[PDB]
Amino acid sequence: VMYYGKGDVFAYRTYLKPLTGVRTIPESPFSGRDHILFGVNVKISVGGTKLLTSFTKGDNSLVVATDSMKNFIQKHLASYTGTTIEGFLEYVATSFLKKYSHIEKISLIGEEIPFETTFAVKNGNRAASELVFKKSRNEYATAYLNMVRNEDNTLNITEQQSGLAGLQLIKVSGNSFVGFIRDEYTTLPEDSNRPLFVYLNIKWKYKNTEDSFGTNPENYVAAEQIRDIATSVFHETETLSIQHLIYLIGRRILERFPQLQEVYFESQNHTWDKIVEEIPESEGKVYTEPRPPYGFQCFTVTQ
Amino acid sequence: VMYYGKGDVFAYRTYLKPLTGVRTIPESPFSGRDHILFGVNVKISVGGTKLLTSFTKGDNSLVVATDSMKNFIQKHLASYTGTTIEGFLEYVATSFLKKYSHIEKISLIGEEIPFETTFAVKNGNRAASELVFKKSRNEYATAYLNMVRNEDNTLNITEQQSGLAGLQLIKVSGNSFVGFIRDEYTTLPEDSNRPLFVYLNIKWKYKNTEDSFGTNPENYVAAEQIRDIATSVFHETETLSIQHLIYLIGRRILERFPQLQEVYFESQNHTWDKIVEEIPESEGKVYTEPRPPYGFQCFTVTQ
Amino acid sequence: VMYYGKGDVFAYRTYLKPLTGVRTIPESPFSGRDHILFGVNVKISVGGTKLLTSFTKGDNSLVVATDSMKNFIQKHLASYTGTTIEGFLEYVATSFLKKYSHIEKISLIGEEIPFETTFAVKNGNRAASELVFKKSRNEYATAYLNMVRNEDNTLNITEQQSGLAGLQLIKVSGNSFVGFIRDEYTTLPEDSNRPLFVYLNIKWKYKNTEDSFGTNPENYVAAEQIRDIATSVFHETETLSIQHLIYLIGRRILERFPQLQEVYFESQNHTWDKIVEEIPESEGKVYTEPRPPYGFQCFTVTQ
Amino acid sequence: VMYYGKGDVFAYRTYLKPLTGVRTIPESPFSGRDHILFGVNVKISVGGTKLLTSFTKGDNSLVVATDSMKNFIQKHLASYTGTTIEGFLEYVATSFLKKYSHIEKISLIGEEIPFETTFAVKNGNRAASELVFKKSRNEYATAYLNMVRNEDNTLNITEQQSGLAGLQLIKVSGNSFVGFIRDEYTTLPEDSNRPLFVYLNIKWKYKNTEDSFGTNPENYVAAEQIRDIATSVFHETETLSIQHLIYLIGRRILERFPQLQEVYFESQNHTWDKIVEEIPESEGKVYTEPRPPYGFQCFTVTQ
Ligand SMILES: O=c1[nH]c(=O)c2nn[nH]c2[nH]1
Ligand SMILES: O=c1[nH]c(=O)c2nn[nH]c2[nH]1
Ligand SMILES: O=c1[nH]c(=O)c2nn[nH]c2[nH]1
Ligand SMILES: O=c1[nH]c(=O)c2nn[nH]c2[nH]1
Ligand SMILES: [Cl-]
Ligand SMILES: [Cl-]
Ligand SMILES: [Cl-]
Ligand SMILES: [Cl-]
Ligand SMILES: [K+]
Ligand SMILES: [K+]
């Protein structure tokens, strides 16, 4: 393996071209993004056989400083005329390979830095502010792109993936986990009604990578829509395990978005331990945080 | 100093009695909490002269185990018939002092563990779920209470404070910071239009401690309302510094809630560094994360 | 309350004047500090009635920018000719109040950023390197200093404290916790031999503030020596609780350092849960991490 | 993809069989591990085609509960008679596949939870304690192992790697970074003498998997030895870039351990920004923390 790059390249742009014309689905109010504030955290990795002597001999002649890669990314967010993180990564990748002929491969990760709407009152009326936003530490969109230079000097996208990360959902009832193996190592009681608490990271791939860019917005799949499908399916489903749930979320996503080829899940189980099972004259219960070990599941659904 | 206790006592309750009937204000449509899910992180500290030998002699005779304090809190969340964190702390404090005659003082901190509503579809109609919630790592309510046993065996609240922590707000324009001292130590340029990014922790005290419990909801001041005041005032104000902003937020809070005696602010400056000042054919700019040092301000406004 | 300032002011200095001429104690081999590399994280807070209009009117005329405070601290670490973080704080404080006559009070916290010795082979032998250091995320020394300008324009130190933070110590056997209250809230079993795991934060106060600066280093009390007293007393003691342990550590500190007035402890219990009590043919056991709630104790020992 | 498992399975064991009989190298005084206290954090992932219906149908018949996997790992740490984390992983893997014939693949990651020696005074002298240990949050050893069940129910190891994570080393002088590309994206000045601060994660792979287990300990490669090579080479080298440094470290590792097939580096650059370059009557300087973006390098050295 031989590559190098820059991580945690934060870049915030005001007034990016708005994303409009996105096809709505019944699960979600999402129709677009105003892009008054657009934040991204970029990681760039580059490779090429001509980088070898930078390692083996300390020769810096063909080293683009990682600091310069940071400058490259920040300047390109200023000149970017598109509407999505996916398209931004393509712009950066293409631009970087066009600039630096000795680089044969570039891999980019972009993570949205999400902001939420806030409200303000003017002359007695409360409305969404176009100026003040709330920084969210909750779920966020992601994008990944790898691009290579071929021997005939064409540039080709070899991998593209979009995602939603950091989604933490708890369903207070309507979840079971029963029927699993009971042997000498099993102490977990069967539970016909648990408050299943899952962390979800959901990633999707498009049949046609161009659809990821947002250039034809009707084919774009927004992370916000994926969020709302996940919460709707969780609500609707009498879950039988996390495994069972994520398969059903995946199926619904692929149904709603025939332009997608696959959906990949990484889930974790953070369900609370029960402390008080019955409260007089109430349906309520009390739970607390578990010990650190957490279950996880990984599964791909294909179109 | 001589006390001991338990921290990070997480307790989650389903179907707490709903908070209803809260008086609305122009800045906020908040009227109550459904309390399908109610999460709190409690810290309990206790003292009393009779604890001395637990330290000086290793005599555990009058040691309530910290593990038992944890059990005490969790059990009391199950039996609590009220509607606020403030009220819950009063219930635990009074109960604990009534139980353990050798304890002369109890301090409690409670921090809300916040959950947000999510969408689900039934019959093509998207509505808020009553089952599925999103764990939020953004702002959260807080409460503080200290209670002492007097020499005549009466129990007295000696301090009470409510709060909102973890609010992170950025206003993209309509902020300045000019006119500060310029001497041998000053390198900061004056900025007539900065994208001010502040972290806010806001705490209030009531004139009458009883109003904090929520038993008469008309007199209760909800953290959600304070949040909405802060965003509205930030939007409305051409800020001249964070100092200037927090004073104005404070004044608006005390105007809206005459039952409050004071509001206390701890703010931090996290404003991004500008990288690209002018983008062709756009109002946009590009910013990035600053170096670690952060400014802060601390200020009390009184009624 | 009314103050403002700067936090996370990191500053790294090479070749600070070494600390030597210290007075030894039986528990510790500590003999001074080389100071090839000296790192500090400083927080500065300033106050004064003349700052009021910076809040109430947005008048920045008498505002020292927090960015300028950062510059002040960093420049002063360059010119500091002493040997201790405590002395550095006094130097900054005095210098700041002298520069800014409208400031009435300054509070400083300094936290050591610790580095550890590494070894290298050269010229035929393995020896301590004078160039390569390992950054440590373990325990670190602390210092606190407040200074005021009096009505007559003279300066006084109004509080000084030194400390050790982040010490995490586990004793595998020779600890008990028995004899505590067993009532309707108790589920903790008595344990005659537990692997007590404590987090310790230890703060001390000198009778004479001058002894904290290092100017007469024989009177200085080093965090390294305090660490060594803590580990020694923990080993020596059949502990009966954390309360019992910290009292004994405090007594030892005050016996070894008669120039101290008092020592304050903040301890936390992070003792592991037992999984396997008996292992065939071995004295070993197996333990795991507990649920999040942690016990804590706060205790002052005075001469 | 289809797999599931448990993360953050902490297990602490006292009195594991000591590691001794290791083969020394010039860079390291390492001579073994006492194993009075041995801590590991294990992640387990399992897969196999027979798990499909747990996802597609909610059928838990062939599901080993992740909680059971946690129990399995903890109980196996009690019965493990070996001397290395690598050997522990092999023991767990073999045992698990033997127990659960419907599982086709198991992956394990083990991370050391490191403890450091402390000293105590007893019987007249200060000596290393056999009872009290300091938990370290610095560098730690790692191990990876994957195992498969083939058609004939035979088991094979399919991947094995050992490593050292979390090493943070700063060298105050004797580092340059000059001669890199200076173009329209470059603002980094050349630096003939910088205080290079690198984070290092180093992974190695043995020619013969058996050498990783400790069974013939003279063939074992200890993380402690690798650490000591890294510090020595960093000290010895007038570095020309991080790329240049890690190549040299890798060459030294492979020269010292001919039983290794390759060594892989992940490095990051966290070098401080300079604030004061010249101090009167001193060789010292002052530096501070940089903005968040960090350079990184990824490189494999092979025999
Ligand atoms: O949904 C679940 N899947 C699992 O594999 C599991 N194991 N324990 N609890 C569990 N819950
Ligand atoms: O709002 C601000 N207040 C301040 O005190 C300050 N100092 N630097 N920048 C600043 N901004
Ligand atoms: O040392 C201890 N002190 C305590 O107060 C306590 N409570 N539970 N366990 C405990 N251990
Ligand atoms: O050692 C370095 N390698 C790099 O690639 C680099 N880029 N900026 N600074 C750097 N330092
Ligand atoms: Cl699970
Ligand atoms: Cl500030
Ligand atoms: Cl405790
Ligand atoms: Cl770099
Ligand atoms: K000594
Ligand atoms: K040696």
Side-chain angles (χ1 to χ4, degrees), chain A residues 1-42 44-97 99-104 106-121 123-150 152-158 160-217 219-276 279-280 282 284-303, chain B residues 1-42 44-104 106-121 124-150 152-207 209 211-217 219-276 279-280 282 284-303, chain C residues 1-42 44-56 58-97 99-121 123-150 152 154-209 211-260 262-273 275-276 279-280 282 284-303, chain D residues 1-97 99-103 106-121 123-143 145-150 152 154-250 252-273 275-276 279-280 282 284-303:
Chain A
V1 170
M2 175 173 66
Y3 60 89
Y4 81 118
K6 200 76 169 187
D8 276 354
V9 181
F10 295 93
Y12 300 98
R13 158 92 181 256
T14 52
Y15 304 107
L16 190 77
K17 181 180 188 241
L19 174 68
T20 58
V22 169
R23 178 172 75 84
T24 71
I25 53 163
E27 286 83 8
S28 179
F30 181 84
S31 47
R33 297 168 186 149
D34 293 328
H35 283 154
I36 298 173
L37 183 53
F38 176 97
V40 66
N41 178 350
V42 179
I44 179 171
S45 304
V46 301
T49 60
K50 284 190 188 187
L51 296 181
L52 181 65
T53 59
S54 72
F55 294 86
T56 63
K57 294 185 172 166
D59 187 344
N60 288 327
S61 298
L62 284 169
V63 177
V64 177
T66 69
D67 189 80
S68 305
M69 298 177 194
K70 175 264 297 184
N71 292 336
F72 189 98
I73 291 166
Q74 295 173 345
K75 287 180 157 171
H76 279 74
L77 183 60
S79 63
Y80 181 53
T81 59
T83 61
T84 65
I85 296 178
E86 289 93 344
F88 176 58
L89 299 187
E90 187 282 331
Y91 177 56
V92 174
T94 289
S95 294
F96 197 84
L97 296 182
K99 174 61 189 183
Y100 297 116
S101 60
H102 63 279
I103 298 297
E104 300 180 314
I106 181 162
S107 173
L108 294 158
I109 293 166
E111 291 180 343
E112 173 193 27
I113 305 160
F115 298 87
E116 300 185 341
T117 302
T118 70
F119 299 262
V121 179
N123 294 319
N125 294 265
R126 187 171 190 270
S129 169
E130 74 281 11
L131 297 178
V132 179
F133 303 87
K134 192 173 83 176
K135 182 173 180 351
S136 179
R137 290 84 79 195
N138 301 330
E139 70 276 4
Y140 57 93
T142 65
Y144 171 67
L145 186 69
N146 189 84
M147 186 178 294
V148 306
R149 185 197 314 282
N150 300 311
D152 66 4
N153 280 289
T154 56
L155 306 183
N156 187 50
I157 292 168
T158 57
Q160 184 285 326
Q161 190 177 38
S162 302
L164 172 63
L167 185 60
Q168 300 184 5
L169 301 178
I170 185 270
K171 187 184 181 193
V172 296
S173 66
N175 306 286
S176 81
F177 191 60
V178 304
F180 51 90
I181 290 168
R182 308 197 72 78
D183 62 12
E184 64 179 298
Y185 296 105
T186 308
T187 53
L188 181 70
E190 290 205 329
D191 200 337
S192 62
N193 189 18
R194 63 180 183 172
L196 175 61
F197 187 13
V198 295
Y199 293 4
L200 295 170
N201 188 296
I202 307 174
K203 300 179 180 185
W204 51 98
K205 290 184 178 184
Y206 288 77
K207 291 173 177 174
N208 309 126
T209 50
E210 180 70 34
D211 287 344
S212 72
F213 304 149
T215 54
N216 178 2
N219 296 329
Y220 185 74
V221 176
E224 294 90 333
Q225 298 177 305
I226 298 296
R227 173 197 65 211
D228 296 336
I229 291 171
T231 61
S232 190
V233 172
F234 198 1
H235 177 95
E236 290 168 57
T237 303
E238 306 295 304
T239 66
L240 297 172
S241 64
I242 297 172
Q243 291 91 318
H244 174 239
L245 174 59
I246 60 179
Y247 176 77
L248 289 166
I249 297 174
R251 291 263 68 94
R252 183 65 62 79
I253 290 170
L254 294 171
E255 290 165 11
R256 287 285 175 274
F257 298 117
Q259 67 268 44
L260 295 182
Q261 180 63 45
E262 72 160 57
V263 187
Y264 170 67
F265 295 82
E266 296 175 332
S267 57
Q268 304 178 5
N269 190 346
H270 292 272
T271 302
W272 304 319
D273 285 333
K274 198 183 287 188
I275 295 312
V276 181
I279 299 173
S282 164
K285 292 151 184 233
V286 178
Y287 306 89
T288 189
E289 295 288 352
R291 292 187 177 87
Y294 62 87
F296 63 82
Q297 301 69 29
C298 305
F299 191 75
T300 307
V301 190
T302 66
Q303 184 61 271
Chain B
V1 175
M2 179 171 64
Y3 52 93
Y4 80 119
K6 200 79 172 186
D8 277 356
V9 179
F10 290 92
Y12 301 96
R13 162 102 178 246
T14 56
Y15 305 107
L16 191 79
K17 180 183 178 181
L19 176 66
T20 59
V22 173
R23 181 181 67 87
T24 59
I25 54 163
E27 290 80 6
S28 185
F30 175 89
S31 44
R33 303 170 185 145
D34 292 331
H35 285 154
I36 293 166
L37 193 55
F38 178 94
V40 66
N41 180 355
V42 182
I44 178 174
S45 304
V46 303
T49 61
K50 301 271 208 64
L51 299 180
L52 181 60
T53 60
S54 70
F55 295 87
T56 60
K57 298 192 183 303
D59 183 347
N60 291 324
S61 294
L62 288 178
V63 179
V64 178
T66 68
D67 189 80
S68 307
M69 303 177 188
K70 172 265 297 182
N71 289 335
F72 189 97
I73 289 163
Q74 299 175 344
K75 281 173 159 184
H76 279 73
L77 183 58
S79 54
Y80 176 53
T81 60
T83 59
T84 67
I85 296 180
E86 289 91 347
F88 179 55
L89 299 190
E90 188 275 331
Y91 175 58
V92 170
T94 291
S95 295
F96 198 87
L97 297 182
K98 285 180 170 189
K99 177 65 190 175
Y100 294 116
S101 61
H102 66 280
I103 294 302
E104 302 177 309
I106 181 169
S107 300
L108 294 156
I109 297 165
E111 295 179 345
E112 175 195 22
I113 306 304
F115 295 92
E116 295 180 346
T117 60
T118 71
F119 288 124
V121 182
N125 189 52
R126 183 176 60 255
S129 182
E130 76 284 8
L131 295 181
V132 177
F133 300 87
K134 201 175 80 170
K135 181 112 153 191
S136 178
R137 288 84 78 200
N138 299 334
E139 65 281 2
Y140 56 95
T142 65
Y144 173 66
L145 185 65
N146 190 90
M147 184 180 298
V148 304
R149 183 197 315 283
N150 299 131
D152 62 5
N153 239 252
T154 61
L155 302 189
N156 289 28
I157 292 166
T158 59
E159 189 163 17
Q160 187 282 328
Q161 190 174 41
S162 302
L164 172 66
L167 184 56
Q168 302 186 3
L169 298 178
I170 183 267
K171 186 180 179 190
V172 292
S173 65
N175 310 285
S176 79
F177 188 59
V178 306
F180 49 92
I181 289 166
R182 309 200 68 84
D183 65 12
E184 63 181 299
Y185 296 106
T186 308
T187 58
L188 179 67
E190 285 188 331
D191 195 342
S192 60
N193 199 349
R194 66 184 179 167
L196 179 57
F197 189 8
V198 293
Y199 293 8
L200 298 170
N201 187 298
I202 306 173
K203 295 184 180 193
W204 48 101
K205 297 186 166 177
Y206 288 81
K207 290 175 171 182
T209 302
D211 291 352
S212 79
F213 303 150
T215 50
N216 183 356
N219 293 336
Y220 184 75
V221 175
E224 293 87 342
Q225 297 173 299
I226 300 297
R227 175 197 57 209
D228 295 340
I229 290 167
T231 64
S232 190
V233 169
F234 196 2
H235 174 96
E236 295 168 58
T237 302
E238 298 303 299
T239 70
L240 299 171
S241 62
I242 296 170
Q243 291 90 319
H244 172 243
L245 171 63
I246 63 179
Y247 180 75
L248 292 167
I249 294 172
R251 285 261 74 94
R252 183 70 63 75
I253 292 167
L254 296 172
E255 289 163 3
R256 287 299 179 249
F257 299 115
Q259 68 265 51
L260 297 183
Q261 182 56 34
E262 72 163 60
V263 189
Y264 169 66
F265 290 85
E266 297 182 326
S267 54
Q268 298 179 4
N269 195 340
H270 291 273
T271 303
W272 304 322
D273 287 335
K274 188 196 272 176
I275 299 305
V276 182
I279 296 176
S282 175
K285 307 191 184 173
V286 174
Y287 304 92
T288 193
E289 291 292 353
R291 296 182 174 90
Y294 61 89
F296 63 86
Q297 300 75 22
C298 309
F299 192 73
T300 310
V301 194
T302 64
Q303 184 68 270
Chain C
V1 176
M2 178 170 70
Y3 60 95
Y4 78 118
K6 200 76 166 187
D8 278 352
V9 179
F10 290 92
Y12 301 96
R13 161 79 187 257
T14 54
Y15 306 103
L16 196 75
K17 177 177 173 174
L19 173 66
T20 191
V22 297
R23 175 187 298 143
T24 66
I25 57 163
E27 290 77 12
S28 185
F30 176 77
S31 67
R33 300 172 182 151
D34 295 342
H35 287 156
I36 290 165
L37 182 57
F38 177 94
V40 67
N41 177 343
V42 179
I44 179 179
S45 313
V46 304
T49 58
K50 284 167 185 155
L51 301 171
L52 180 61
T53 55
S54 74
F55 298 85
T56 59
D59 176 4
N60 291 320
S61 298
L62 290 176
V63 172
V64 178
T66 72
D67 185 79
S68 304
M69 298 177 191
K70 172 215 51 160
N71 293 334
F72 192 96
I73 290 156
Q74 290 174 343
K75 279 180 172 176
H76 279 77
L77 184 60
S79 58
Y80 180 53
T81 60
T83 62
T84 66
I85 294 178
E86 291 90 344
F88 176 56
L89 298 190
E90 187 279 336
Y91 178 55
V92 170
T94 292
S95 289
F96 195 89
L97 295 185
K99 179 73 183 181
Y100 301 114
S101 59
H102 65 284
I103 295 300
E104 306 182 314
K105 55 200 156 123
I106 180 166
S107 298
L108 292 162
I109 296 168
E111 303 182 332
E112 174 196 27
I113 311 304
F115 297 87
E116 288 180 358
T117 292
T118 70
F119 298 70
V121 177
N123 302 124
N125 77 324
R126 196 170 52 233
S129 178
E130 78 281 9
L131 301 173
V132 179
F133 297 92
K134 190 179 80 170
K135 180 167 196 120
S136 175
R137 289 86 79 194
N138 299 330
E139 68 280 359
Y140 56 98
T142 62
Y144 176 64
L145 179 75
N146 293 352
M147 191 178 298
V148 304
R149 176 190 285 269
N150 298 122
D152 48 71
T154 64
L155 308 186
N156 276 268
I157 292 169
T158 59
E159 194 167 6
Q160 187 279 321
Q161 190 172 50
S162 301
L164 176 63
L167 183 57
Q168 304 184 1
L169 298 173
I170 184 257
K171 182 179 181 193
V172 294
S173 57
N175 310 284
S176 76
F177 188 61
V178 310
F180 51 90
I181 291 165
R182 307 205 68 84
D183 65 14
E184 70 269 32
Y185 297 104
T186 311
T187 58
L188 186 73
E190 297 196 293
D191 194 343
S192 51
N193 192 8
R194 61 184 182 168
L196 179 61
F197 186 7
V198 293
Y199 292 8
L200 292 175
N201 184 298
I202 304 172
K203 297 185 180 173
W204 50 98
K205 287 192 158 182
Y206 292 77
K207 290 169 177 189
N208 307 129
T209 297
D211 291 352
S212 79
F213 301 144
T215 302
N216 297 320
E218 66 274 22
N219 295 324
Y220 187 70
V221 175
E224 296 89 336
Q225 295 171 309
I226 295 292
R227 178 185 58 229
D228 291 340
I229 286 166
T231 65
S232 195
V233 171
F234 198 2
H235 173 94
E236 295 173 52
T237 303
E238 299 300 301
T239 68
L240 299 175
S241 64
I242 296 166
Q243 289 90 321
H244 172 239
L245 172 64
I246 60 181
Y247 181 75
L248 288 166
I249 298 171
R251 291 258 64 96
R252 183 73 62 81
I253 292 170
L254 295 180
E255 291 164 346
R256 290 298 184 248
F257 300 110
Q259 71 268 45
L260 294 178
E262 51 194 276
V263 190
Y264 171 66
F265 292 85
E266 294 182 345
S267 58
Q268 301 176 1
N269 191 346
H270 292 272
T271 302
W272 305 323
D273 286 334
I275 301 305
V276 175
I279 301 178
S282 160
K285 296 163 175 197
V286 173
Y287 304 93
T288 194
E289 293 290 351
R291 295 184 172 88
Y294 60 88
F296 67 82
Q297 299 72 24
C298 309
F299 190 77
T300 304
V301 189
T302 82
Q303 297 284 12
Chain D
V1 171
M2 180 174 61
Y3 60 90
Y4 79 115
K6 200 79 165 186
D8 277 353
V9 178
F10 291 94
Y12 301 97
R13 156 86 189 256
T14 54
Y15 309 99
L16 192 79
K17 184 184 177 169
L19 179 64
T20 190
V22 302
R23 173 189 297 143
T24 69
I25 60 168
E27 290 84 6
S28 185
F30 176 78
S31 65
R33 304 170 177 150
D34 296 341
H35 285 155
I36 295 168
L37 183 57
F38 177 94
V40 65
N41 177 347
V42 174
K43 174 184 273 152
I44 179 174
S45 313
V46 306
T49 61
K50 289 171 191 127
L51 296 173
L52 184 59
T53 59
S54 73
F55 295 86
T56 60
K57 291 180 178 215
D59 188 343
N60 293 322
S61 296
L62 289 178
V63 173
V64 181
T66 67
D67 185 81
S68 306
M69 297 175 193
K70 173 210 65 167
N71 294 333
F72 192 98
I73 291 164
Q74 294 174 342
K75 281 189 188 173
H76 279 74
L77 188 57
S79 59
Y80 181 51
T81 61
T83 60
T84 70
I85 301 173
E86 294 91 340
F88 176 59
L89 297 190
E90 190 277 334
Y91 176 56
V92 172
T94 294
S95 297
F96 192 91
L97 297 180
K99 182 68 184 189
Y100 300 112
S101 61
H102 66 280
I103 294 302
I106 179 167
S107 300
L108 291 163
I109 298 171
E111 301 184 341
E112 173 188 33
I113 304 155
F115 298 87
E116 295 181 352
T117 301
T118 69
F119 295 73
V121 177
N123 306 122
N125 74 321
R126 187 171 58 240
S129 179
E130 78 281 7
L131 299 176
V132 179
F133 299 87
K134 193 179 86 179
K135 186 178 201 114
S136 178
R137 288 86 79 193
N138 298 331
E139 67 280 1
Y140 58 95
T142 62
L145 181 81
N146 292 352
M147 189 172 301
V148 62
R149 176 200 329 278
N150 303 306
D152 57 347
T154 65
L155 308 185
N156 281 88
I157 293 165
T158 63
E159 181 167 20
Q160 187 281 322
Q161 181 176 55
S162 301
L164 178 58
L167 189 56
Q168 300 184 3
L169 298 174
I170 182 258
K171 181 183 186 194
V172 297
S173 60
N175 311 282
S176 73
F177 189 61
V178 304
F180 53 88
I181 291 172
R182 305 201 66 81
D183 66 9
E184 69 272 29
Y185 295 104
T186 311
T187 60
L188 182 68
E190 295 189 289
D191 198 340
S192 62
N193 194 349
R194 64 181 182 167
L196 179 59
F197 187 9
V198 295
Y199 291 7
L200 297 172
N201 182 302
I202 306 176
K203 295 177 174 177
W204 51 97
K205 290 189 159 182
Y206 291 81
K207 291 170 177 184
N208 306 127
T209 303
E210 183 69 24
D211 293 347
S212 76
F213 300 149
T215 303
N216 290 313
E218 65 280 4
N219 300 325
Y220 186 73
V221 175
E224 296 84 341
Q225 293 171 309
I226 295 290
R227 180 193 53 218
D228 292 340
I229 289 170
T231 64
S232 192
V233 171
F234 195 2
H235 173 99
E236 299 170 55
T237 303
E238 304 299 305
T239 66
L240 299 171
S241 65
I242 295 165
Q243 291 90 319
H244 170 241
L245 174 59
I246 62 180
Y247 183 74
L248 289 168
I249 297 173
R252 183 74 61 82
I253 292 171
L254 295 179
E255 283 159 6
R256 291 297 184 249
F257 301 110
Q259 70 264 48
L260 295 178
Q261 185 162 301
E262 47 198 281
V263 57
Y264 170 65
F265 292 80
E266 299 187 329
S267 57
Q268 302 178 1
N269 192 345
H270 293 271
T271 300
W272 305 322
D273 285 337
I275 300 309
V276 181
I279 295 169
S282 177
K285 297 173 181 180
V286 175
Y287 306 92
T288 191
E289 295 285 355
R291 292 185 174 86
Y294 64 88
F296 66 82
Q297 299 76 22
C298 308
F299 191 73
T300 305
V301 189
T302 76
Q303 297 283 11

